Structure formats: C-alpha cells, structure tokens
Amino acid sequence: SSPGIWQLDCTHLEGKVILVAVHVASGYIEAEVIPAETGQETAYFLLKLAGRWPVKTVHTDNGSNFTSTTVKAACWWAGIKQEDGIPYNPQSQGVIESMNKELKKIIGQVRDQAEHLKTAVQMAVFIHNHKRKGYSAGERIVDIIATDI
Amino acid sequence: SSPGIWQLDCTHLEGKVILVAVHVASGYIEAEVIPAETGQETAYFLLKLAGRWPVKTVHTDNGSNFTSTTVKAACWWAGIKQEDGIPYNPQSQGVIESMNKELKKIIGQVRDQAEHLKTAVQMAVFIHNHKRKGYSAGERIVDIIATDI
Numbered sequence A, B: 001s002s003p004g005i006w007q008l009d010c011t012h013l014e015g016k017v018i019l020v021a022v023h024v025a026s027g028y029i030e031a032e033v034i035p036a037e038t039g040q041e042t043a044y045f046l047l048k049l050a051g052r053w054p055v056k057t058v059h060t061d062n063g064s065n066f067t068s069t070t071v072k073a074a075c076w077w078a079g080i081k082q083e084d085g086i087p088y089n090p091q092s093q094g095v096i097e098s099m100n101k102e103l104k105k106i107i108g109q110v111r112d113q114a115e116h117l118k119t120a121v122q123m124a125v126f127i128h129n130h131k132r133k134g135y136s137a138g139e140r141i142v143d144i145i146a147t148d149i
C-alpha cells in the first residue's frame, strides 16, 4: 500500500554516514548523520521514523540491516513489514543515486553556514522537502496520507 | 495560522532532559533526549522539526531559548516566527503538565523494553501519536495540514 512505503538509503560524506529514509510515492525524506551504519543505529532511526509517519513497509538498504536482529526487533515493535530493497524495477537505483547526488549538492550549498555536518544535513532535508516541483515533497506526502485516511 | 503552530516543552527524567515539540491543534509530538537544555540543542531540534513539518510559529518554552542567538538564527534560517510561550489562555499550562505526566507514564510502561532512555522516549512518541481518542494525533495533524494546503 503506497502511502506507507519507505526506502532506506545510506550515503557517505566527510568520512561519516548519512542515513536517509525516502517516502517513495512523494520523494519526502528524513535523514540523520551517524558514525557508521550499524543495525543498532538503523533500528533506532526506524523507531523515530515510525512514530512520526505511518510506516507500513520499509525496503531496507542492504542485507546486513535486513538480517540484523535489532532491525528485526524494531520493525516488529513498530509494526513495520521489512522487505528487501532489490530494485525489481531497475529505475529505482537511478532515482536514489540521483537523490544522493542532489542531497550532496544541497549540502555543499549550505555547508559553510554550519560548523557540523549533521546541521548541514538537516538544512538539506529542509530545502529538499520544501522545494516546489506544482507541489513540494512535504505537500505531497501529507496529501497522500490524508487521502488514505 | 493554526496549522503551523507548535509549542516547545522541556521535561526531566533519569537526570536527563526530554525536549518536546507539540503541534497545538492536533496534540502530535516530536521529542528527543539531550544531556541539558542549551540554545544550541534547541536550535538544532527546531531545524529538524521545520524540515519535516510546515512550522510557522513556535511558542518557545522559556526565556533563555527565546533570547538565545543560536535559537534566533535557526528560526530565521527556517522561516519560523519565534513567540513567547506565555499562557495568556491559562489552560495551556495544564495541557502541557498533563502531557508530560502522560508521556512519563508511557515511558515507564515501555522502559524495560529498551536499554537507553532515548529509545524509550521514541517508543513513547510512537504510542502517543498512534493512540486513538475517533482519530489519532498523527491522523489529525495530517488532516489539518492537508486541508490547509
């Protein structure tokens, strides 16, 4: 069910890891900076996400997170169906690749306004979610979910 | 105005600080655990919040955060109108007091399922936002904002 489908995405910058969740139908994102991708960090990120939006299904970003007993525990706790992130539809790869490039571009544009990478990432999330393309990703996710309710 | 109005709230547990943002019209919350309330932490919290929901006005929780140059910078950056949290309507105090008590109750109910307080707080956010009272706070915030769009 489209309103509840999210995709995990992990990208790298400044020797750190940026963990991203994308709401597939809208392009809306949430992101955090972590020292490295672990099952524990991914699990905690999902708990946060699921308390904020009605997360039904998550396409996990890799096999280690898919396998992680802590990720499995969090998905159980939060009522999330854990699925693989295998792009059966092959355009899914390019969309995420493009989003990572786009996010890094925005991060570079704001980078000098913040001391810490985590702050620049949140500024980039803001800009991404507010950008009109016409509705913004923030507007689309709200409309999609409201219609579903 | 109503769709974009949030209230900051700071409460204490286990020698730590729980920073809460409440969407006044719906009762929907976002929360984080921090070692202590500083302007820096409050500012960062607001940047995160504003990238995720259309935050127009924030009733700050105290005068130190209202005054903080870092909080002011974040509100400027994110297009947030910073206001005081003075309850001209005196029922506002009791509503927040009650929410803090309610949150702590839920935290106590989940506390043994997580090692770390921050995790229990996110579990409590989840339970709070999903609880049907009939719509949940999560459903109400989405409806309110969608209608506004």
Ligand SMILES: CC(C)C[C@H](CNC(=O)CCCN)Cc1ccc2c(c1C(=O)O)OCO2
Pocket: A112, A113, A114, A115, A116, A117, A119, A120, B040, B041, B043, B044, B070, B073, B074, B075, B077
């Ligand atoms: C709001 C922005 C224009 C300036 C804030 C204040 N920053 C500055 O004024 C310094 C910018 C000069 N390079 C950024 C900020 C807010 C809150 C934080 C931060 C940072 C950050 O700088 O990363 O770290 C964690 O908590």
Ligand SMILES: CC(C)C[C@H](CNC(=O)CCCN)Cc1ccc2c(c1C(=O)O)OCO2
Pocket: A040, A041, A043, A044, A070, A073, A074, A077, B112, B113, B114, B115, B116, B117, B119, B120
């Ligand atoms: C999902 C929950 C039932 C179990 C997770 C795994 N926890 C356990 O199984 C231990 C439970 C001990 N009572 C909780 C968890 C997930 C992710 C984290 C955590 C914690 C946490 O425990 O606080 O800390 C930071 O990152």
